[PDB]
Amino acid sequence: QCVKLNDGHFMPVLGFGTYAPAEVPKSKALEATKLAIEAGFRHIDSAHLYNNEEQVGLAIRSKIADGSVKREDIFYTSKLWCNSHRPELVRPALERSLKNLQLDYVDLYLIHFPVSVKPGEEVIPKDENGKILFDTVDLCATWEAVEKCKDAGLAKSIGVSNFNRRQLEMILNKPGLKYKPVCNQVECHPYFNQRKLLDFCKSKDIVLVAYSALGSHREEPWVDPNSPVLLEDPVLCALAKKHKRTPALIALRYQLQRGVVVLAKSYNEQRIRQNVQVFEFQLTSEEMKAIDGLNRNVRYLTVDIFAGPPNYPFSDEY
C-alpha cells in the first residue's frame, strides 16, 4: 500500500531499514538491499550517517537495470547529518549522497537529528579531550535550505527525524514557510508507542514513521544492553502463535493499523522475506488494545552523547 504525504506524494507504508552496526561489513548492505527489493520492499531508508549509500544505490540501480523495478517504483530516503546543518552545507551534503548513490534525486530528505555538530568529515567530531564539538545553527535556516533542495528537484519530499512537538511547531510556525515536513521519523514500538506525539503529527498532517520498530539494533554503546528485548515480549509471542506469524510481524502490523508508516531492518534473507508479509493478516481492535498495554516508556536510542545542547529532543514530555 501507500500513504499520501502532505505534498501530494506517496510513501509505501512498509520501509526497509539499512543501518547496520559498525562491525557489519559494507558489502552486506548491498546484498540485503537487493534481497529486500526482490522480496517486495519499495521503500528504502538510509542516511549519510550509515556509510552505505554507495552500496544501497548500487543495489537499487541494479534492480532497475535488470527490470525488476523502475526508479518511480522505489521510494528512497536519505538524511542530512548534524555536521551539515549550516544552510550553505545542506545542498552540498545532498549532492554528495546523490553522487555516492549515483541517482539524480532522493524521494525523501530528512533533517536527521536536531542537535548540530562542527562541520567537517568527522560525523562525531571531538576535541583533544574527547568532548563533542557542538555547532550553533538556527534549524529554521537549515529547514529553509532543505526547502530549496525540493525547489531544485534533488529531493521530491522533505521531512525531519527525532523532532519533538516544540521543534515541529517551530517549523510549522516559521515565517515564510514554503513546505511542511511530510514526516517525523522517530523511535516507535510497543514498549514506546509515541501516542501523544503520534496524535500531534496526525493533527498537522505529518506522517509518523517508526524506526527501531522491532526493538532496535541494540548496538553498544548506543543502546543500553540491560534494556528489555522487545521481540522476547510474551504478549507479542502469544499473538505470533495465535495468528501463525512471528513477534516481529506482530510488532509491524501494530504500526500499520494505527496509521504509522513502519521501518524494518534485516540483513538476514529469511527475515527480509518474512517481514514483507505484514500485509497478509490483521489484528482485531481488541488485540491492538492489548499491544497498547505493552507501553513501558523504554526509549532504546537516547542519542545521549548529544544531551546537553538546548536542541536535545528527548528531555521534553514529547
Ligand SMILES: NC(=O)c1ccc[n+]([C@@H]2O[C@H](COP(=O)([O-])OP(=O)(O)OC[C@H]3O[C@@H](n4cnc5c(N)ncnc54)[C@H](OP(=O)(O)O)[C@@H]3O)[C@@H](O)[C@H]2O)c1
Ligand atoms: N533516523 C534515525 O535516527 C534512525 C535511528 C535508528 C534507526 N533508523 C532506521 O530504521 C532502521 C531500523 O531500525 P534498527 O536498525 O534499529 O533495527 P530494527 O528494524 O528495529 O531491527 C532490529 C533487529 O531485528 C532483527 N530482525 C529483523 N527482522 C526480524 C525478524 N523477523 N525476526 C527476528 N529478528 C528480526 C535484525 O537482525 P537481522 O539483520 O540479523 O535480521 C535487526 O538487527 C535502521 O536500519 C535505519 O534505516 C533511523
Ligand SMILES: O=C(O)c1cc(Cl)cc(Cl)c1O
Ligand atoms: O540509524 C540511525 O539513524 C541512527 C542514528 C544515530 Cl544518532 C545513532 C544510531 Cl546507532 C543510529 O542507528
Ligand SMILES: [Zn+2]
Ligand atoms: Zn487476531
